[PDB]
Write a protein that binds this ligand. Structure first.
Ligand SMILES: [Zn+2]
Ligand SMILES: [Zn+2]
Lengths: 263, 263
């Protein structure tokens, strides 16, 4: 055990070398066309093992993803599902533009076709691997609040979810870094919780992350505070949301319910 | 000379102590209502000198702003203009949600009412101090391209400009950090340049910032590369934008025109 990783980004594939590239050049017109590769791998699942699967954060290849154990086949299936979803029209229910990947660290690295050497992490099974698109999260959020305003509320929720992602996304190795990446996951999953806040005419002000006093010993718990405010209307109370995250586990967990109160 | 600062964020004010707070409690119903303070200071400009003016990045008070020199009055006027714009309805032409502040470092600090001690920076005159709102930038961008699609293009441009801000915003002290903050400024100002890219169905992939070989000695130049790609449609060329920024000056400058080419 070399520690855990909790990473966000973009899934991709890499041929590693020219021999593997050539193998796939014979199997479709253009193996660099990911649409064609998705089709090929969907028809021939075992060929997925012949690629290097990568996690990419805003153009930086940060990890190679190695499925191992009895659920490797299951994991390859999710890899393909995520690859395919990224290629969908932005209006598709299966569209994917956000991704979470929990993994175990190793001391293994792999060389990409480019010559770059990236660290390998073990993805043992599909649990905790999520793919989202922002529009779908916003629609879920809108369903829980009363209004028209919808266009304004939709754009406010969109801007909130995107801000949280870009403010926090990171390499996902240290405890704090895993906590910040998992904060994004938790914010996405609990999007509707913040909808009344945005609908009330508030917007995110601060994100604060502290080591939590609320967990058992030998946990790795962090308290995350999101505070919302209204810049336009005088003295108005600030709304705080708190949740507690335990990242000691390779599958991080939320501890208790999301708390909220005014200041 | 202790170096330069190039900072982004939110302008605010602070009373420093209870005596100064009380002075303003007698001058309006509620001095914590920034709307009331804007009104008071617009009618009584010299009272602005009695406040601590702050720059705030996502809830962290990062600097106290000290206007000095023969243009201090001019600078206080801009402070007020920025404070007022932040309070406008989001639909107002004068709405402000993004801010750039160039300044000279000092070795002076000031204590805020809360007891926090923050570094003071000197803002000598209004040059290079910009206030934007994203919607207005997007409207400018849309004016230069052909379409309908507008709703889709508007949201794509919005997401781009917001991503760049949250990806890059920082404390703004080191050369690299000033370069990244100024990249945001330059991206905003040159928003229309990226509009064809987004209209073509591409989106930002990577931001890369390197020390530039294209400037004179004793400059502090950085090359910024923004690469755009289309995740949906097969093999399609990537579009690169490059510009060169010199942050040696307290007012950073762009060097040459923005370059663009395909890969
Ligand atoms: Zn980002
Ligand atoms: Zn941000």
């Amino acid at each position: 055990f070399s520690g855990n990783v909790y990473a966000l980004g973009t899934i991709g594939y890499d041929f590693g070398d020219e021999a593997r590239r050539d193998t796939f050049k014979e199997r479709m017109a253009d193996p660099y066309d990911a649409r064609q590769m998705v089709e090929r791998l969907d028809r021939n699942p075992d060929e997925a093992r012949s690629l290097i699967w990568t996690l990419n954060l805003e153009g930086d290849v940060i990890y190679a993803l190695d499925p191992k154990g009895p659920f490797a086949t299951n994991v390859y299936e999710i890899f393909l599902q995520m690859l395919a979803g990224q290629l969908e029209p932005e209006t598709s229910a299966d569209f994917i533009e956000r991704l979470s990947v929990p993994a175990r660290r190793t001391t293994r690295t792999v060389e990409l076709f480019s010559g770059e050497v990236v660290p390998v992490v073990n993805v043992r099974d599909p649990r905790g691997m999520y793919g989202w698109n922002v529009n779908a999260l916003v629609d879920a959020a809108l369903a829980t609040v009363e209004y028209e305003d919808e266009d304004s509320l939709r754009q406010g929720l969109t801007a909130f979810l995107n801000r949280v992602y870009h403010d926090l996304h990171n390499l996902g190795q240290t405890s704090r870094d895993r906590a910040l990446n998992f904060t994004v996951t938790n914010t996405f999953q609990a999007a509707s919780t913040f909808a009344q806040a945005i609908a009330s005419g508030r917007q995110l002000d601060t994100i604060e992350v502290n080591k939590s006093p609320y967990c058992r010993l030998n946990s790795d718990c962090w308290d995350v505070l999101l505070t919302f405010y209204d810049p336009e209307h005088g003295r108005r109370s600030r709304r705080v949301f708190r949740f507690t995250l335990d990242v000691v586990y390779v599958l991080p967990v939320t501890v208790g319910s999301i708390k909220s109160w005014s200041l």
